[model samples]
Target: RSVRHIAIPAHRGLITDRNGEPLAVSTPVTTLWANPKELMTAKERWPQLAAALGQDTKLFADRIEQNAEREFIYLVRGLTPEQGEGVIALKVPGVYSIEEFRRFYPAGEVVAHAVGFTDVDDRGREGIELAFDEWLAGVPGKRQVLKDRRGRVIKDVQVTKNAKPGKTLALSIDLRLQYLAHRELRNALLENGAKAGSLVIMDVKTGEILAMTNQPTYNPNNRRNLQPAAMRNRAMIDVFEPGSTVKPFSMSAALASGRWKPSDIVDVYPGTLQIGRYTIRDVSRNSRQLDLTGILIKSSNVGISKIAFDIGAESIYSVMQQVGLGQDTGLGFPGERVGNLPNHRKWPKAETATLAYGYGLSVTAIQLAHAYAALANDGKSVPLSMTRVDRVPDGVQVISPEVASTVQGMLQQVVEAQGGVFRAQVPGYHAAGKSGTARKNAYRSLFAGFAPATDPRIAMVVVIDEPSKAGYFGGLVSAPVFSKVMAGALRLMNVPPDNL
Candidate 1:
């Protein structure tokens, strides 16, 4: 029988943006192999062959010797068609090139954390590539073919199982917004002299992620200098104390209890509050008496502490849980973290107060973005999604629309008021967001909110880790990034400006 069974590699699926622009796709390549037994006579040409394959002559010869007992060994894998053809021209005995598909990332590091990359064997290893491996990876099929003594397939005989290509995946990410976010975040990281950073933008009405990017990203196309640290999707995995960003949630709890009104005032005289040997203070001395809006506008830690204690720890904790803190965003990306939110039941007075102002607990950037999305969606907690959706999923009610609107109004005051997040205000549009600066050995600066305050369209979060230059305050380091990215996104999505 002249028939020989051969394995046919199937092409991996295409991963694209919501509009169908390819982010990751498989391209045909060639893998060069040699039968070790037949390659012994070619040893004299080993040096020249190694040079063409980019392998050291000594190492190349050693590898051939080591695999001498094996029937076949890979000399080189995943070479371009041109490269493979060049190798075949060398006329080395027993050396042949087999067709295979290799994964190529069109966006490179811009979408690395989202599209991920595959190993040389064409297996998924990280990000969405790994998350949807079963769906993105194809089944290798078997075929019987007629081959000559020279190991060339002369004719096809029968296909036992036709290779089934992987299914195409449509991600919710907008590549244009992704590029915008990535470029701006990288610039921010460099400008602020930050150690790392992350940014996420989501559609307020749909809960679909528009863009998510991290600094210190690596090119998935080139794995030579890959570092584990750079490979991390910081937005989904890294958690930090949210600082003043938690103030809105605390305010939500106060309103939900019906014990506090938007107009209610709390005295924050001298800007400091002492609770069980711990002292919480405001950023500056002003407004001895402040209403709920005043408390958020000034980002007064003391005022928020007073409000949280008044609302009770359980109430605050309930609001936090309702916003999806201490839980996963349900994207199911590999290595995703749920963050830490200790139960209020076990918290002491100080712990409770601190947690009220985004300390003693941690949250991933995506989780914070998710929470802010709830505020933008009128207190409806929309589950975060990574894939494109035709309809907005029903949201779990986390707060009353009245409460969300009130808090959102207060947040708008935060941007509009003197000494508030002026840097976050988008030109020709009203923006509402909170700036948070947390000190944990190094400072973490964060800005989170949505735009068009009255009619929200986009919600976003920007985090700068360990900023050493320019400034360490969230307003200084992160708010500008938010402003730039949001402005571009709003324009790209054609969302009209509320201020205009």
Candidate 2:
């Protein structure tokens, strides 16, 4: 069993979802090489190197003549085997050829952000590459080398080393869900003329990410056209005030503190509630006594503000902290901005009121989905996880099981009956979620939501950024996206129809 002394090339480990779906892998390629010494010493060979290898005679001559260590180097690093053979047919004295591996992503733009792209040297740089660089990089091995130009080796000359392959990495992502989410997000982006979009699907019970999609994505195969903004995974990386979607938090806090009951009545005061100098108006514009359920369904800013005042800012912020806001989800990714939530001490009267309706405080899409999942999961505030967790996360008890159930029931009405979110209603599954539309700090708009109200199995959030020439309401622009994704996800998970 003699070992071959071929130049062994190793690449970063390929990445796959927990289910072993290939997300990233490496493929073999041939490279064109030049023996610069031969080109400089043998003028006859110089023209062959330039003609077959497509190099300038001056550059080839300089590279061969100028560098002491230019004995062997690749003139071109990623040629096809046929190309390599053609170059080799030229038979320049110093030129040699070998095969190398390069990263290949079959899913291309669909899973760009999750799998990330590598550099020419097969080095992981961004996305999963940056996140799991060490796991993917394997140790290069040494092989024994015994021959030179004469096909003979001097005794005691050791030229080869052994190599070790890299470890295989697995992700918690489900590619089926990824494709579903990507389809929905891309449709929303194109239909609404949105600047960009993102969608995330998570398992409520395990905190495992089923899918994550960011629009305006690039193909890992042709990353030459990738812009810096297009490569961002906005679901976890971007943050904003969540608008009316924040109503549920204040409502939950009020219920938890015994400050309000679901059936309790409060005057909405001519569709406006005054808190200091600012006035909170109802989007529905109905000034009447309504219950906790009505406040959320109608998405009344006044109603939520009053509830926050009763719950007190301190309790609301406490609930926010417990729900994983203002913190990291530990997804092993870079540029995760821990969203902002002012402490009780920093809460000004106006900001407190604004925070109630998702105006003053900021949160990422992942954080918002996790917060809503708490209500869906019977008040258990499980940490949002991007990787698979063997054990169930013991979520902090933020609200009572009874309160969570009550909230879930109320959230469902926002989709049921006519005129509300009829589009978000799946034909045979129970679904409940709030839609959000907000102005972006940059040149975009945003929409976000989650679904499947009763006995929930799949949770999702869709965000379309800066849509042009369309309605700005999340329900109008983003709710249909939620419905489409939820429908496919339920079908794939084989979630039995609740109607049955």
Candidate 3:
């Protein structure tokens, strides 16, 4: 039987942003192949063939010999049309070209971690590409053909299985916001002499991620010499001690327990508190007695510890679990991390106190953003989405609106009050956020909050790792980035200014 079967490749789906701008696309290309048996005796022509294919002659000959038992072998895949035509002109026996596809990233590193990339075999390997591989990969078709003894197709016999193209994927990411986040994060890393950084922006109402980016990113289009460290989606994968950022949650638990009110006072005299052998202290001396709002505004570890103890460990831990700490944000991105939150029942007094003030627990940037989004949505925890969502999911109520509003009001003082993150204040909008600085051999500075504190619209988080030049404090390093990016994002989304 002269009839032979061949597989026809179906094109992978296109990945676009919320605005329909292409991010990852499949481009048709030619792949060069050869029959090892036919090429074995053509050693003299090997150099010319290798020259045209951009391979070393000896390496090409060795590969051909190694695959001698195989009827077909790929000389080079993803060749440009010009290169394919050039090889065809040489008319080397047993050499032929087949149509295939190569993945292209239009936005390159800007959307690299979001869109991810495909492998040489056109298989999704990372990012959204890997997350939705089943939906994005097309089914190959089969066709019957009449072939000559030389294995060349002489005529089409009959059609067999038809190729099914992949379905298009629309991401929740806004390209404009992604660009802004990427640019600002990169600039901040450079300006602060930071080792690395991550930034994430999300819509408060829908829980859809508008943008998520990391520094030291790699271009998905160019896969040569890629470093595993550079390819990580830090915002989703890396977790750190949240530092003072956890105070709001502690305050939330305290208020929700009915054991403390917004006006309850805690004595933080000399700005330090001793628990066991560990001593937790305020960053600076501001007050001998601080109310709940004062605790947040000053980021007093001693003040928050007193409140956490008053509220009890189980109550505080329950509130954290309700807000998604130690849980995945459900984006399903490859390598996404579920941060560590130990059981409060197992904690000692010092561990409990430190956990209250943002130590002994870890969180990813996405988790922090989700928690802050819950606060902005008035105690409703919205499910975070990476793909474009048609309607906002009904959020689970984690706290009473009254309690959420109380914590939010206190956070507002974090950005607006003196000794708070004044640098995070947006000029035309009322912004409220908390800053965090944690030490783990090095410093991890973070700022997290939402905008238009009175009428929330957007929530964001920025984390700078190991800043050497600029101050390592979260307020000094991460808050400024929050201000610039949040200001631009709010204006871009046309959210009306509340402060002005």
132 Cα displacement, candidate 3 (Å): 0.3
Candidates 2 and 3, the one with greater TM-score: 3
Candidate 2 residue-wise lDDT, 1-500, digit = tens = 23335545566687888788888888888977655545555676776667666678777666666753454666888888888898788766666777878988978988888778888877888888778787788877555654444222323235466566777887778889899889888888888888888788888778877888998788889767568898888887988777777676677788888667889977786998776677777777755887788777777778887777777788777777777766677776888777887765667777777787777677888887777777677878777666566777687787778877877777788778454667777777878887776756333333334445658877787777777764767887788888888889889888878754
Off by over 4 Å in 1: 1-6, 41-62, 145-156
Better of 1 and 3 by TM-score: 3
TM-score of candidate 1 to 2 decimals: 0.94
Q: What is the lDDT of candidate 1?
A: 0.88
Cα error, residue 248 of model 1, in Å, equals 0.5
- Which is better, 1 or 2, measured by lDDT? 1
Per-residue error at 378 for model 2, in Å? 1.4
The C-alpha TM-scores of every prediction are 0.94, 0.91, 0.96
Positional deviation of residue 458's Cα in model 2 after best superposition, in angstroms: 1.1
Write one digit per residue (lDDT tens) for candidate 3, span 320-414: 88999888677777888998988844657787888898888888999999999999999998889998989877889998899999888889988
Write the residue-wise lDDT of candidate 1 on 121-161 in tens digits: 88999999999999999788999988665444568888999
Q: How many steric clashes does model 1 contain?
A: 0
User: How badly does each model clash, as a count of residue pairs?
Assistant: 0, 9, 0
